[PDB]
Design a protein around this ligand. Structure first.
Ligand SMILES: N[C@@H](Cc1ccccc1)C(=O)O
Ligand code: CUA
Ligand code: CUA
Ligand SMILES: [Ca+2]
Ligand SMILES: [Ca+2]
Ligand SMILES: [Cl-]
Ligand SMILES: [Cl-]
Ligand SMILES: [Cl-]
Ligand SMILES: [K+]
Ligand SMILES: [K+]
Ligand code: NA
Lengths: 585, 586
């Protein structure tokens, strides 16, 4: 009834929830403790991390594939895998708008373990997960219409072969499952609580490239996907492929006004943005952005819509409440209220969904409960467990783009303001302003008990299994060996490390040799991480307890070159060093 | 003392944290301990494009090829022994660099690779009469020349050097060859003396060798003597570097004019100047002590009026297991991390001095448990004669069970401690990524930042020069300049529209995009990302930023604004059209 949760997490006390923040155009994922709002860990994903060597090590570059050549990413939408509509703590997925990727993070090790470049698209933006029966598919929007093929003969966005596609990735294999060509474009997406339906907002129904063109239509739409119908067509072989990708491609466009089997287009005003599934599974709610509304699609009416039982796609709209200026996203407390960010008015508005549905029928009922000022210009917002049937109505985070005077000045570039709001009672209460770097757009919270992590690595972990395989071809037992393998101009150093000593403390090579150093940390004490840096060679990486990590570099400078442990690991940490001796050409 | 900063309240101090082996500098508010900004330095930042933009790579020079750094020691420029808020400097141990950050724009504006050395570790600034020199230690002994003919650390031409960088020019000023090696460093309150700890007086490469001697030393530098030798032209140069090199090694037991070696146990680490200017305090690490060098006595030591370099030691208090660093409250107390005992020990410097003369007095005042294994520690304004005795941060290397589990890699634990009273009080546990080693605090009124860029700012003046060569007025022009296989796009940006919304190139063209943000509203930053080309940068109000990339893929390629700038931010986009190679001269 009253909103009175405690926010202080004192020394020695622990946070109640994990928070997983997108890193925005900085490209990483950040783990926070909630309600303290402190950053506990950074998980490199699309960024190159000097500390752990993500982007430099062989294990990381193998996961990134050819996209290892890119040093940037732009991530917005972190989501946790589900079983039976509840978080299962297995995986976190996130998009990369800058280089068109999806990444998977394993929540037991808190590392990115798979990455895919989505084929034949540009800019992976919207991303959310199937909820029921479990996260079989990752659903991802490609935002920008492009020519097909994109070979430089045709540039017109109006061409019959210019379009974008909705993407489904197999969550477990991290291979593409299928793609659906759509009209217009794609902004954000969500899924239902059965597995049959997904939905995405579109703001460029006009297929224009200019600002005024993209705002011409009074209504764009939410495109709804009959995933069962897509799956049936794939199983029957009723698909095409594009370019050199084997991914099954289904055509979800309207042809001469005739609907595809795979899609329905529900008109929604106007350049709508957020696309959020209510926790009771009743509605896809589209945030109206240029229209001061949200539109509520009754998921219960979608089978009739696809069966041809409804005379008009607008018939699945059962509410369209007027809320305020610039609605961008919606979340849920599991008590029947929705909470929507108003970018222009700079507020969070709390409103009762069933009352909004009755107001749409002509009933005189006030569905707006409260408007709370936020600081300033909120984008997305997220209530604890909102993406699950266990939405607990405890905490809300609103992620606001202009912090202005809310923090000390730090130069021309400002932090975002991610504000923690207590929603446990009848009144929302602002309790903490959290400055963050580079515009997290969205975040996701999980109860402490939904996340189970490893304290030390398993020696059979898939994360470094290819390196274990390399060692096997060299006849190396990584748990014990300290040896230097010579192979023409290639040199493969294998060593164990146990604080405060590297297992190989010197080695000699020829100028120009390509050197690979593989280190296995055989300490068993939790938290005794080691590092490895080769001075003046651009080489740096983490080796945590029982991990094997490897890095490759060319020894292009004759002479003595020191290497050292970068992770303070022991009172003799400064002395944990070695020498690479490079004999001149 | 208020410990919690509520919504709408501001922090009272800035904190500048080192980013450790992550390579950036982090700006925190104190006492909230929240991170307000990240300043990329040695890391590549996807968000702002540091390491990708032409302006950043120009500042990095040839070292722009490295994607890593390892920074430990951030320090703020001083005038008359007080922070003046102009510059922050920090080391790079990984690739042997020093970087300068301009505190008005909160960006690294200068970087230097220190010549003929390996691993820049210790770094601190001259205090008096102002920060003319940045002092930096090269940690590892190497051969000179390091050409692969000699590897022996015991060769007469194998050594390391102490380094002085001109703070304003960010060019080398001089280097001093030393015996042993170099760990941490600090400077006095006169400008004459600096000092550095050494742990490898043995010139060894193995753990046992490096621990062999019961004492190493702190080496003291007479900067007046170095300066006088440099003006007299009495120096040599190494390799292709023109930096004056002076010889501070002993030769057959005889001291050089530039250095004195004060025996100190044992593999000492921290080297900290007391805020009253009396002492260089070396933390004994493998010896459970700190050693106090009376800066008073250094002139006499350099004049030969003392029988034993130890005679400048006036205190050696026994404190506990693994002393690593010392800081100061400005009330006559010192605070020392004990890495092994996992504590901060508060002690009275004058009473330790009296105890050294046999007067039995208990100089130890309190020991506070920290969590766990503290390295460096920093009290507010400790590096100045304004040491205010309010806040202390202890930066601990093992956080274990102090935060929620996050997998095998744990955060560090930087703990905020109230030292305003007689009793140290632990108030906040602050988790941090990648091992900040040290940090530095400044009062809010010691830092003055710009809200909008100046159009003549040196950060992008080279880009303005390039534009002028093309006849461009960056404040107004939206033009595509063609120059063979180079294409130079110049545009203004004003939310929510790029001033050039489309341009066409040939496959293989080298494209430079230069964008000047002509919005005047504070906080209205723009971004620029080219999809699937690895291209990303920030353009803040009144900044010009530029980036260069190869249009290696035919077809249409979207670009977009990455910084939420406007209600129509999703629609602030453009298109690069790349004509296929088969349609152009092979
Ligand atoms: N495309 C050519 C290189 C070239 C291009 C244009 C002019 C001249 C040479 C190959 O070889
Ligand atoms: Cu291993 Cu420090
Ligand atoms: Cu410009 Cu968003
Ligand atoms: Ca539209
Ligand atoms: Ca020694
Ligand atoms: Cl959304
Ligand atoms: Cl309620
Ligand atoms: Cl120090
Ligand atoms: K912002
Ligand atoms: K650590
Ligand atoms: Na992959």
């Amino acid at each position: 009834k009253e909103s009175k949760q405690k926010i202080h997490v004192g020394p020695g006390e622990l946070d109640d929830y994990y928070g997983f923040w997108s890193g925005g155009h900085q490209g990483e994922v950040r783990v926070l403790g909630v309600p303290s709002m402190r950053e506990l860990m950074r998980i490199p994903v699309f960024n190159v991390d000097s500390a752990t060597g993500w982007g430099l090590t062989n294990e990381s570059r193998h996961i990134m594939g050819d996209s290892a050549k890119f040093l940037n990413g732009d991530c917005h939408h972190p989501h946790i895998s589900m079983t039976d509509g509840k978080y299962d703590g297995k995986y976190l997925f996130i998009n990369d708008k800058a280089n068109s990727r999806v990444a998977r993070i394993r929540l037991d090790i808190m590392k990115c373990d798979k990455m895919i470049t989505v084929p034949n698209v540009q800019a992976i933006h919207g991303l959310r997960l199937q909820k029921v029966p479990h996260t079989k598919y990752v659903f991802a929007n490609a935002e920008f219409i492009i020519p097909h093929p994109n070979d430089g003969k045709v540039f017109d966005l109006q061409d019959e072969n210019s379009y974008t596609m909705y993407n489904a990735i197999d969550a477990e294999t991290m291979e593409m499952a299928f793609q659906v060509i759509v009209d217009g474009n794609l902004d954000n997406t969500d899924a239902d609580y059965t597995g049959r339906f997904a939905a995405a907002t579109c703001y460029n129904s006009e297929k224009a490239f200019d600002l005024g063109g993209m705002m011409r239509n009074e209504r764009d739409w939410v495109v709804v996907f009959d995933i069962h119908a897509v799956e049936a067509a794939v199983k029957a072989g009723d698909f095409i492929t594009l370019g050199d990708s084997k991914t099954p491609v289904l055509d979800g466009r309207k042809k001469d006004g005739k609907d595809s089997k795979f899609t329905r287009y529900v008109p929604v005003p106007k350049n709508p943005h957020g696309c959020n599934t209510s926790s009771d599974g009743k509605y896809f709610i589209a945030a109206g952005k240029l229209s001061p509304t949200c539109s509520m699609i009754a998921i219960d009416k979608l089978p009739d819509l696809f069966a041809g039982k409804l005379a008009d796609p607008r018939d699945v709209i059962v509410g369209e409440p007027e809320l305020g200026l610039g609605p961008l996203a919606t979340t849920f407390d599991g008590r029947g209220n929705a909470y929507t960010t108003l970018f222009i008015d700079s507020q969070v508005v709390k409103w009762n969904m069933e009352e909004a549905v009755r107001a749409y029928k002509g009933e005189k009922v006030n569905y707006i409960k409260q408007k709370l000022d936020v600081h300033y210009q909120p984008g997305h917002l997220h209530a604890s467990l909102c993406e699950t049937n266990e939405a607990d109505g405890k905490w809300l985070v609103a992620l606001s783009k202009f912090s202005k005077d809310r923090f000390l000045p730090v130069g021309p570039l400002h932090p975002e303001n991610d504000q923690l709001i207590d929603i446990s009672g009848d009144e929302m209460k602002l309790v903490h302003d959290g400055p963050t770097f580079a515009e997290p757009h969205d975040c996701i919270m999980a109860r402490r008990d939904q996340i189970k992590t490893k304290k030390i690595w398993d020696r059979n972990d898939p994360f470094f299994a290819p390196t274990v395989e390399m060692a096997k071809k060299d006849g190396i037992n990584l748990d014990t060996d300290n040896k230097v393998i010579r192979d023409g101009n290639k040199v493969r150093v294998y060593m164990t490390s146990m604080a405060p000593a590297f297992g190989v403390q010197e080695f000699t090579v020829k100028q120009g040799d390509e050197v690979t150093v593989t280190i296995t940390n055989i300490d068993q004490i939790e938290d005794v991480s080691h590092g490895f840096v080769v001075v003046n060679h651009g080489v740096s990486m983490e080796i945590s307890p029982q991990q094997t990590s490897s890095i490759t570099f060319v020894a292009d400078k004759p002479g003595l070159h020191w290497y050292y442990c970068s992770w303070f690991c022991h009172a003799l940490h400064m002395e944990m060093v070695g020498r690479m001796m490079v004999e001149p050409a």
